[PDB]
Symmetry: D2
Subunit: 385 residues, 4 copies
């Protein structure tokens, strides 16, 4: 029942199941994991792949020999399991050098270092088979209003992403970029704080088609926004290159709960959308097994992620398949919503008297939308009633 299989495209970061449990107020509650053990245990669970930061795989400051050896080990384990690496990313946030940002650090040399550090890991991402390269600008921001001229910072952010797009263009790489937005934490306000701000930013890049969004459930909910709506707008724009799934209990610190926790109904509507829309990219879980757990709880957490996706997937499909739902959708005119407002054209619209001078504004006002009956049907399918 609800057993995950690699065709489900479930992926996990090395940093997720390998989180040692240090939080702002606490020390690690778990010993570090061998990336190789993660690969094999995740493959046993039914995962489709893993993702990594450069420094999850290669300890910061490794000479090429060590680095090569760390990669050969990781490469070996993927070979033995058939595990994919669909996405990679750079750690531009842990090391104190990045304390004011990577690509938008006030210090010019830190910015050039961040780009060299990322270019090095793009080569490795592509060699390992990554379709998407993620930019999380967790340190691009400020705690106070004078510390960052945001228009200059967006110049530097644009300049960095333009250079990376020129790099993958000159190398011949197929990889595309996804910005992962976050409204705040660890900076007091982070640049490109929501899906929307990142989508707007991409349109100003030099090669907009190389760039998409990698939205995370909990980051949009940290702004109180509706994650299914924002995903729908990324899909609408054609930019849902990737997605991070997890749970969040509203506006507060980034919890990275497992997927299905936090906002259960929004997780349902998310799965309904991803499946209805035919999203075919990774179902990536960017979660943190709570530091209250041992390693047995870490893997139970990872399995819950996939399991909750598959239950929601089952309930959303039965919702859409249900003829009572089909009838309720028509009673609430979701059909009419897909009809062009004025395919007859502006001039036709302007001369239509039934659209204004002779519009029965009160007969129209009196037609109930029947949204409650529809929603209680969605509730019944979610709960299995």
């Amino acid at each position: 029942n609800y057993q995950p299989t690699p065709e489900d495209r479930f992926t996990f970061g090395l940093w997720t199941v390998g989180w040692q449990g240090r939080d702002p107020f606490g020390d690690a509650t778990r010993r570090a994991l061998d990336p190789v053990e993660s690969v094999r245990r995740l493959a046993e669970l039914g995962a489709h792949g893993v993702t990594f930061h450069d420094d999850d795989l290669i300890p910061f400051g490794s000479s090429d020999s060590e680095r090569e050896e760390h990669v050969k080990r990781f490469r070996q384990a993927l070979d033995d399991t058939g595990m994919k690496v669909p996405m990679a990313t750079t750690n531009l946030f842990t090391h104190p050098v990045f304390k004011d940002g990577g690509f938008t650090a006030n210090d010019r040399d830190v910015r050039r270092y961040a780009l060299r550090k990322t270019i090095r890991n793009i080569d490795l991402a592509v060699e390992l088979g990554a379709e998407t390269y993620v930019a999380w600008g967790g340190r691009e921001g400020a705690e106070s209003g004078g510390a960052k001229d945001v228009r200059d910072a967006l110049d530097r952010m644009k300049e960095a992403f333009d250079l990376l797009g020129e790099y993958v263009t000159s190398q011949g790489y197929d990889i595309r970029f996804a910005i992962e937005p976050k409204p705040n934490e660890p900076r007091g306000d982070i640049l490109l704080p929501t899906v929307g701000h990142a989508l707007a930013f991409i349109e100003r890049l030099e090669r907009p088609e190389l760039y998409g969004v990698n939205p995370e459930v909990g980051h949009e909910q940290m702004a109180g926004l509706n994650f299914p709506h924002g995903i729908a707008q990324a899909l609408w724009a054609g930019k849902l290159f990737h997605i991070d799934l997890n749970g969040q209990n509203g506006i507060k610190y980034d919890q990275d709960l497992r997927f299905g926790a936090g906002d259960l109904r929004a997780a349902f509507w998310l799965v309904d959308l991803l499946e209805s829309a035919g999203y075919s990219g990774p179902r990536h879980f960017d979660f943190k097994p709570p530091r209250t757990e041992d390693f047995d709880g870490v893997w139970a957490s990872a399995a819950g992620c996939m399991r909750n996706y598959l239950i929601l997937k089952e309930r959303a499909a039965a919702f859409r398949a249900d003829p009572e739902v089909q009838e309720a959708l028509r009673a609430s005119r979701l059909d009419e919503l897909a009809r062009p407002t004025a395919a007859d054209g502006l001039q036709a619209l302007l001369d239509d008297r039934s659209a204004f001078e002779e519009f029965d504004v009160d007969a129209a006002a009196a037609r109930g939308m029947a949204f409650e009956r529809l929603d209680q049907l969605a509730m019944d399918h979610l709960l299995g009633a």
Copy 2:
């Protein structure tokens, strides 16, 4: 001291000082105002202009004779005072017909009615002298996940804005459109919920250059976002067509407090940005005099709005002019932030050994950003210390 004058470009909606005090839990605490009296009292205060919804000026359902008479009165008062009308908008939210939206109402005929209702008021806006026409889609949204297919809704939203852009193009009008984003209320989630989502949406329109944003202080703060940063990104994109100023005490219902209340420091940084960047559009106050006030408190509220702008304007200018601030900005490398990261080009960057192999990551990590001293200087100027 801090007396407002029409060159300051301070404008007010008819619905602001004319709010009668009905809230979700309460009846009106003030009698309705004559638009004409508003015009004259605001001109006495030092306002530069007024804005209106169609139904603030012409009672809904007025035959052309009444409508013409209401406009002749309003036209007369503007003539007598020299008051400008820089912006207008349509009321697509009060009347029960709009209970599921205007441009994205599930009901097709309501959508066509909303467009005819807006086209009629565009003609009036232009005749009265409006540079900007604002779309607030307060009813475009949902309370539940199945009630609205967001990708279809954005099709209809795009189709409506494309038709309005075709309308003003065929008439020869100079007017441009500004979306006013709002994350929620009166709908549980509103489409295009932030500056960012609206900027992304505009890039998909057919004539993107006709459309900008009209951001409101309190709406971005209802998502917990940094209003100065989002304004900086609108400015960066070249889309700050208009702006709504007011106060908001964080994430909660839309308060529409007067400007300067709510987040005092963010109001300071906002004014610093608008003035540094050279924004030359209206300083529009979309506030609500609390229903605790009489009409004497209504005008004191309107005056406070302008007064708090002018005090902040004075403090932000002295901040920038202060050589100690100038030195602190250089100590925090805001200068370096304006320097191209790699004007030498990708290949130069790639072969720079001082940007990676020979980067002293620890000397760079050890340089303090000096943001605290900078911010305490901004605090001292704000408070006049």
Copy 3:
């Protein structure tokens, strides 16, 4: 399946299913309801009772003859259906006189009027059979810091509740009082903003035992707080006199969605607590059928409320009954949590070397809490997997 019956104790306010749909931005989308029709339609649905404000039943300003007639009608309908009135309340918020508060209005005569208005409705509540009288101080608060001396306001709030407690004591009434807390809206900050603040306030009253809390799901979630935890603390203190059930999607305006919407998991844990703890008071639904609905949607909304309670009640019971859950609870030491920490006494504790000098802090640190497996079991039962 999940059909509600009067033994379930489901009650509804006259103002819930009778909400006409006016919100801050919109006009009514439904005609007013006859209280008598509400009584009969709710009884048909399976409700146990109704609640009312004075002005939901008697139009404000009714001479005694009309008032008597409105009560005789309502009394008649209850007789015909067997509908209970377990709780009543006073409207101290709609009328403009209450614009700065009722019991804490700065104006002394408004305060005395509020008490007379409430005393009049206490007599009616008791005659109709009310066990609980609710105080919602929606207008007790401020939009700005100088407008209200909060220590003086709490003096007046205490003085009002002390007088009402002296009133019901002298009349011989069995009725008890419940404060319904709300953090904000319609005032910018409301006094006694959470369950906790109200519980603290009651301890300073003269007859603390006459007063409890009437918490609402959405009001605590408007502060981002955990409604099951706060209910647990009310229960712990012995003060859960009543409860308002509904849905809320986080920190934003008060939505009054139907129960089960908003935070689905928190609704589950709430029902688990109310049923485990043996709460035997009303399951009162203080919700608002969205103004998008017609009267058919209003009753479907009311039925959904009761239905979602009964599904959650079924899932929470199967969770507790499940031996796998029982074993998981013991693995996570919920049993140990119910054990006195030091029933052996302070001196025994102080001389226990195994509690400090010889405590294996690292064997204890290494025992995983097994909370993930427990929570995935709760998820499986909720979803029916």
Copy 4:
């Protein structure tokens, strides 16, 4: 100008200026500080005292010899400067043993260890001169609903605080306890999440008079609550034993910005209240110098804290002293708010016809509260206009 002196009662934790800069996503950006250096540098700045956790002063796991030596050093430095230690606290949150709580850890032996660890530091706090002992239950809580039976947890919390109260009673100590509330982080929901919940909890303790609250600016604002109002309610209840001052930009992770940042107006009203009410306890700053700073920025941060208090103190005093403010307060009837509502008694109230039957509800409704003019006066004094 605004130079702090020890009579101002400004205190700082060892953990504040000694924060090394590790956050959930980052490594330390500063080397550790010698407690002794902190004492001397803070005394040079004008501080009145320092506070500590046990493990800020004595490295966890120190034999008595080391421990004694660490205390002799710290004792020496206080002697040389005259620095007070008004408050101490226990670290029950860093070490992995406390991962599920201290006093409410599901594991009974961890609970007994937490009490022994705290009792040991109470002896040291008193010897060093502490008036207040603070309990921050940062690990008392849950991430999921089944992991903690909140009623049992409050039994254990009550049992622990009852034992500590029995301990200081038997030793003859003058010290009193203050709970520092926090709504969330590092746990998903923390028990006793607000000032109110903690005040309610104290009333159920065995010796309620030994216990007060230690509220923090940022923790109540993380729930979106009004920190001046909650402080007013602590003062009203007679429980403001201590207070933590800092800045917070709304609902998001705990920022611990320096005091005066975050919500500038609320900081003003806070100082106005503390000074008007005559609070005479420590002005304790529980802030974190951002990890972007070097040690020079750390001390500039600490100085800004005290400086912003003294500027606000100056502006609030001039506000209250201003006869125009005095007149505006009377126009808004803050005077009437301090008048007993019904000192004439219930029966007098009940027979007053001018309080109901003959109340001019509409003349009263028509009197404007004049809150806007009052608030703009408070704004003018704050900004120095």
